[PDB]
Ligand binder design. Sequence first.
Ligand SMILES: *SC[C@H](NC(=O)CC[C@H](N)C(=O)O)C(=O)NCC(=O)O
Ligand SMILES: *SC[C@H](NC(=O)CC[C@H](N)C(=O)O)C(=O)NCC(=O)O
Lengths: 235, 235
Amino acid sequence: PERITLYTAKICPFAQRVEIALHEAKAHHNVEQFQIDLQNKPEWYAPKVNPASKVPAIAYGGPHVPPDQPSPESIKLAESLILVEFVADLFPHSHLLPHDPVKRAQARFFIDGVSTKFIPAWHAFSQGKSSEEDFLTAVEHLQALLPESGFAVGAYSIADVALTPFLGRARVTLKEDLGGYPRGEGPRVLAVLTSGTGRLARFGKYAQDLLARESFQATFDEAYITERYKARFAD
Amino acid sequence: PERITLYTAKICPFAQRVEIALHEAKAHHNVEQFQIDLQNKPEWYAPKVNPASKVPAIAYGGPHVPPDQPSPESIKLAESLILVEFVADLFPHSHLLPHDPVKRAQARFFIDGVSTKFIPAWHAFSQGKSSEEDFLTAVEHLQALLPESGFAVGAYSIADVALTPFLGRARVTLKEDLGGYPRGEGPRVLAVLTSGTGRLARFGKYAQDLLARESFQATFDEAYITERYKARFAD
Ligand SMILES: *SC[C@H](NC(=O)CC[C@H](N)C(=O)O)C(=O)NCC(=O)O
Ligand SMILES: *SC[C@H](NC(=O)CC[C@H](N)C(=O)O)C(=O)NCC(=O)O
């Protein structure tokens, strides 16, 4: 494929979707990463790369230029889920997109549950807005989609890419008691989520498998995330 | 491909996405349609076809059975945008999904704008909740994505499928003064939207082209929609 510049940020789960995808494609060393400081965004980023002023975004093709001077001739692409499909298209040997039309629809249906159920319910519960039961119920929705063994549709796919960054960050939030509930409640919910026993036994197994995946670990700066999450809570 | 039973409803724009896709694939006569009465949904629909109890949904493969007795052995699939990709996958000669990875990402990005900007802003404005300017601005977002001529990415694609049912219904709502504003305001906004001149000149051309497309017209019961929309407003 043509050259890829990825504009990303270690803190951002949506960006990590694209980093995971590239890693599963064993292409993470082919691409040029540029880290965006979301508290001090470069003045060229929005007008030249992504008018929404968010990561992730990719510049595709065009001439070799420094990443802080992106070329007008490169194709600019945004939105994490699209970028993950684009990577799976560009690198078919990644096997991120299943061949079977049915399994693709199922993988994407799982992504829709991640978008419309898991992420909103995690946001609402981690921010003190909703109940623990509301979060567990949304997880149970994903659990009910899981097959007896393996990942969201058996073989690892884009469905697992879409979810893992948010699961990895939830774990930090919960493990570290940063969820706005008294000391120890976060960790108890983390156990429900990932123990592999109880109402969420099967999801727990799946979650263990997602967090163990090499592409997740390789694109996740746990020390950095933990530090930033503690500091934010402290405010 | 295997046999397709589509559970749909004439009133529903999300369902019409799948009807359009099938028609573009010239497969609309291969599939078995079953109309769901959304005010009196069959008691077998949610437990046997789609637990979300919404159209559209597809039953794929399995034995030949009556559509009100769907087989456990058919694969059940839901969510309009996924079903449109599934149809494009099943019937590649439809040309709904472009081959170029970049044009696919662009088509899907346009769909994201339909999902996150156009549809919410149309809902909010048609229901009396927001301003006309908020709706026009969201349309301008889509307009800015359009190429100089043609459809959302040139050749007709899934991007146009995703938008057209909602555009067709907006037109009825506006043409018929059913938008909650005084007589004549709906029609003036319709003119802004579809005249082909003014702040939305280019989108207007595009919109004319979407509503002229055979697949849209063939899957749109304008008389029925107009009747249902008038009656609802009258309440
Ligand atoms: S995580 C940091 C923020 N990114 C997004 O929210 C990505 C959302 C898109 N819908 C997607 O790609 O999936 C971000 O960059 N925020 C900008 C800021 O100034 O914080
Ligand atoms: S238009 C009728 C309703 N369908 C949907 O809302 C589909 C939404 C999905 N997200 C999609 O397929 O895109 C519907 O069936 N409502 C059920 C009812 O009882 O009204």
